[PDB]
Each structure stands twice: as structure tokens, then as C-alpha cells.
């Protein structure tokens, strides 16, 4: 939404662009558009959904 995607070599994060503060990639930090195949250089990862722990109740 407001950052850039980044990896430390093992894990994927989203950061603000002008200062390295990494955060978990989530459905709040990101927005969808369309299927994978349109985009050059897209990578597979998990995106965490903050409603899933509530559905785990």
C-alpha cells in the first residue's frame, strides 16, 4: 500500500521506502490486483491475514 517489498535472504517483509523498518506482509499492509501471470518478477510468499486468529477462536 505505502511501502516496498524486501527480503533479508530468508524472509519477506514490507518496509517504508526512506527508512528500513521491516514489517510482516499482511492483508492490511497490501492490496490485491488480479492473478500472478500478468506481472514480471512476482515471487511466491505467504500473506498473513489478521482475521484468521479470530476465526481460530
Partner 1 sequence: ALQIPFAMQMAYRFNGIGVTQNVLYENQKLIANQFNSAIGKIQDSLSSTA
Ligand X SMILES: *[C@@H]1O[C@H](CO)[C@@H](O)[C@H](O)[C@H]1NC(C)=O
Chain residues in the site for ligand X (CB under 6 A): 8-11, 40-41, 44
> What CA–CA distance (Å, rounded) separates 29 from 48?
10
- Of 19, 34, 53, 54, which one interacts with partner 1 (CB under 8 A)? 34
Least separation, in Å, of the C-beta of 28 and ligand X?
A: 19
- Among residues 24, 1, 4, which one has the least CA distance to residue 12? 24
> What CA–CA distance (Å, rounded) separates 24 from 31?
14
Q: Is 41 in the site for partner 1 (CB under 8 A)?
A: yes
**Which spans of this chain sit near partner 1 (rule: CB under 8 A)?**
4, 17, 31, 33-34, 38-41
Amino acid at each position: 500500500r505505502e511501502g516496498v517489498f524486501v527480503s533479508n535472504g530468508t524472509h519477506w517483509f514490507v518496509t517504508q521506502r526512506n527508512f528500513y523498518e521491516p514489517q510482516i506482509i499482511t492483508t492490511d499492509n497490501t492490496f490485491v490486483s488480479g492473478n500472478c501471470d500478468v506481472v514480471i518478477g512476482i515471487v511466491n510468499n505467504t500473506v498473513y491475514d489478521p482475521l484468521q486468529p479470530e476465526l481460530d477462536s
